[PDB]
């Protein structure tokens, strides 16, 4: 499932990932944006064997189990292939479990350098929320 921008924040909020630890909406939009163009079904192979998963690209180094990345971690308790479904509660489920792992949403590269300190509130004006 490919969400439209205010769509997937209102799923986001429905599922409580807005403000969760301190990181506002717009933030979770940025981040999906830039790690899958909002699209449930990314998967992208990493240099190290491991396999980032779904709207957020969550890695089979640490989060979920695809049998596939050795020494891994499951740390969310699922198959990497839930963080695919057209229904985000997985993905968003084990985003809050990453996001206070310790280093807040810097753990998605890809928001700290593109939506890091830049006006997230964009990625949800005009949203019915
Ligand atoms: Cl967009
Ligand atoms: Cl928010
Ligand atoms: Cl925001
Ligand atoms: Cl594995
Ligand atoms: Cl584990
Ligand atoms: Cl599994
Ligand atoms: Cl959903
Ligand atoms: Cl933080
Ligand atoms: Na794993």
Known sequence: KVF???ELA???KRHGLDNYRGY?????????????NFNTQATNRNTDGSTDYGILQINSRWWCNDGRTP?????????????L???????????KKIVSDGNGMNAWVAWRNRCK?????????????
């Open 4 to 6: 439209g921008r205010c």
């Open 10 to 12: 209102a799923a986001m």
């Open 24 to 36: 506002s909406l717009g933030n979770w939009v940025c981040a999906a944006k830039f790690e899958s």
């Open 71 to 83: 020494g891994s971690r499951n740390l969310c308790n699922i198959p990497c292939s839930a963080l």
């Open 85 to 95: 479904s057209s229904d985000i509660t997985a993905s968003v489920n084990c985003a």
């Open 117 to 129: 300190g830049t006006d997230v509130q964009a990625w949800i004006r005009g949203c019915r929320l």
